Design a protein around this ligand. Structure first.
Ligand code: CLA
Ligand code: CLA
Ligand code: CLA
Ligand SMILES: CC(/C=C/C=C(C)/C=C/[C@@]12O[C@]1(C)C[C@@H](O)CC2(C)C)=C\C=C\C=C(C)\C=C\C=C(C)\C=C\[C@@]12O[C@]1(C)C[C@@H](O)CC2(C)C
Ligand SMILES: CC(=C/C=C/C(C)=C/C=C/C=C(C)/C=C/C=C(\C)C=C=C1C(C)(C)C[C@H](O)C[C@@]1(C)O)/C=C/[C@@]12O[C@]1(C)C[C@@H](O)CC2(C)C
Lengths: 59, 48
């Protein structure tokens, strides 16, 4: 039957914008992954560790 | 007279607070800062 008659069979990754790129942390493996994370909430977070403040009154 | 006692009260507070703010570390935090001064010291107890 084929088709390509009443529709444009364009090839691409369905994203939330007609042209954009998936964030690095949004691979596309998960169901419903549309590359939608403008705030980067799922971006792997980086943290710094501060040492324990000295609170010894003997010092 | 009022400027004498208001000023004297101001100068006492300023001189006392400035000397206290400049005490050279000679004690720990579990002791009074006063302990850092020994009666008869030949050296200064605060940094002018
Ligand atoms: C004004 C520019 C613009 C354009 C051209 C598009 C276009 C598109 N968006 Mg999108 N979107 C936009 C702005 C825009 N968006 C903004 C400002 C937001 C909020 C930040 C979103 C949030 C958004 C989400 C959450 C989703 C899309 C999706 C889609 C696609 C769904 C098309 C569809 O189902 O039929 C038309 C829909 C009519 C209501 C489509 C290509 C959907 C998708 O899955 O992409 C395939 C999808 O789930 N958009
Ligand atoms: C509390 C509801 C909720 C939660 C927890 C999530 C969580 C997620 N979404 Mg989703 N989404 C939701 C609602 C939610 N969504 C709704 C209602 C829509 C329709 C507009 C969408 C449409 C949508 C799309 C198109 C996509 C996601 C994607 C994702 C994943 C990555 C994005 C991210 O990490 O942001 C975290 C989100 C939150 C921390 C929720 C808090 C957001 C604020 C507090 C709410 C703002 C107020 C609101 C506008 C009213 C993630 C697992 C992406 C994905 O599939 O990744 C695999 C993706 O492509 N979402
Ligand atoms: C906020 C407002 C204000 C302020 C800051 C002042 C401030 C002052 N007033 Mg004034 N006054 C005010 C409002 C005010 N007044 C108002 C509204 C009125 C009208 C009601 C007056 C009417 C008034 C009068 C009539 C007088 C003052 C006087 C004074 C001065 C008295 C302090 C002094 O010199 O001690 C000085 C020290 C002594 C007087 C005694 C010293 C101690 C002796 C030498 C030894 C004592 C030792 C003790 C007995 C034993 C102790 C042993 C052991 C227990 C330790 C002082 C600068 C007096 C003054 O100008 O001085 C002459 C004065 O007579 N005022
Ligand atoms: C839980 C829930 C609803 C539950 C409601 C219930 C049970 C209602 C119960 C009752 O009504 C009944 C049944 C009967 C009534 O008589 C009584 C009550 C008691 C009233 C909806 C959650 C509602 C949750 C919502 C709407 C979440 C929205 C989150 C969004 C849109 C996030 C999107 C993005 O995060 C991405 C994906 C990428 C980022 O970079 C950018 C942003 C945009 C932040
Ligand atoms: C008999 C019947 C028919 C329904 C017809 C429908 C749904 C037609 C949709 C018809 C919908 C059609 C044609 C939609 C087609 C949309 C398409 C292809 C759009 C698209 C795109 C583009 C353009 C973005 C890009 C690219 O080209 C691919 C694609 C896909 O991404 C319904 C019957 C009943 O509804 C009653 C009348 C009463 C109810 O109580 C009971 C029931 C039985 C449900």
């Amino acid at each position: 039957r084929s088709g390509g008659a009443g529709y444009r069979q364009y090839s691409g990754d369905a994203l939330w914008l007609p042209n954009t790129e998936r964030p690095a942390w949004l691979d596309g493996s998960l169901p419903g992954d549309r590359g939608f994370d403008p705030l980067g909430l799922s971006r792997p977070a980086e943290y710094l560790q501060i040492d324990l403040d000295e609170l010894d009154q003997n010092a | 007279g009022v400027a004498g006692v208001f000023g004297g009260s101001l100068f006492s507070a300023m001189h006392g607070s400035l000397v206290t703010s400049s005490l050279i570390r000679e004690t720990t935090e579990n002791e009074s800062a006063n302990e850092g001064y020994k009666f008869g010291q030949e050296e200064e107890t605060y940094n002018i």
